[PDB]
Amino acid sequence: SHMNPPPPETSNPNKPKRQTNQLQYLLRVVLKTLWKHQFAWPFQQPVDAVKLNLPDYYKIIKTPMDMGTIKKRLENNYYWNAQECIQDFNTMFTNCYIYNKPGDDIVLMAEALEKLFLQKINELPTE
């Protein structure tokens, strides 16, 4: 009976756009590497609380984020600063750590993805 919210916005035509080495790197290296990982599939789209039978997910998670949203934002030049993209990644991980219990398979998957994310953003070009 519960409903999913609308996904996060991925495009704003009033927001100015720019292409920096950091953002291109975040799309082509960081996002692409995480997207192909064995554990990416639960994070490639917004959490569907209806299809997954999680009536309390959006009562606990008020800041949803997923890699599909991040990919679409990068592709639309929605981010102006790279820190917006990094914050979205961190928010996705944090949502998974808060909603689920430690030791759940999804949390271990998210932790592996976060380790890879930190390894990949270590080599981020300068501003």
How would you sum up this structure in a few lines?
There is a cross-link at residue 59 (Glycyl lysine isopeptide (Lys-Gly) (interchain with G-Cter in SUMO2)). This protein is mainly α.
Q: What is the CATH topology descriptor?
A: Histone Acetyltransferase, Chain A
CATH architecture: Up-down Bundle
* Percentage of β-strand residues: under 5%
Radius of gyration: 15 Å
Residue share in helix: 40-55%
What best-fitting shape do the alpha-carbon axes yield? globular
PDB class: peptide binding protein
Keywords: ApmTri, acetyl-lysine mimic, BET-Bromodomain, histone-peptide, peptide binding protein
Assembly: monomeric
Entry title: Human BRD4 bromdomain 1 in complex with a H4 peptide containing acetyl lysine and ApmTri (H4K5acK8ApmTri)
Describe the structure.
It is globular, with a radius of gyration of 15 Å. The termini are far apart. It has 127 residues and is an all-alpha fold. The protein has one domain: Histone Acetyltransferase, Chain A (Up-down Bundle), CATH 1.20.920. The chain contains 5 helices and no strands. It has helices at 21-36, 57-60, 67-75, 82-99, 105-121. α1 runs antiparallel to α5. The longest helix has 18 residues, at 82-99. This is Bromodomain-containing protein 4. Belongs to the BET family.
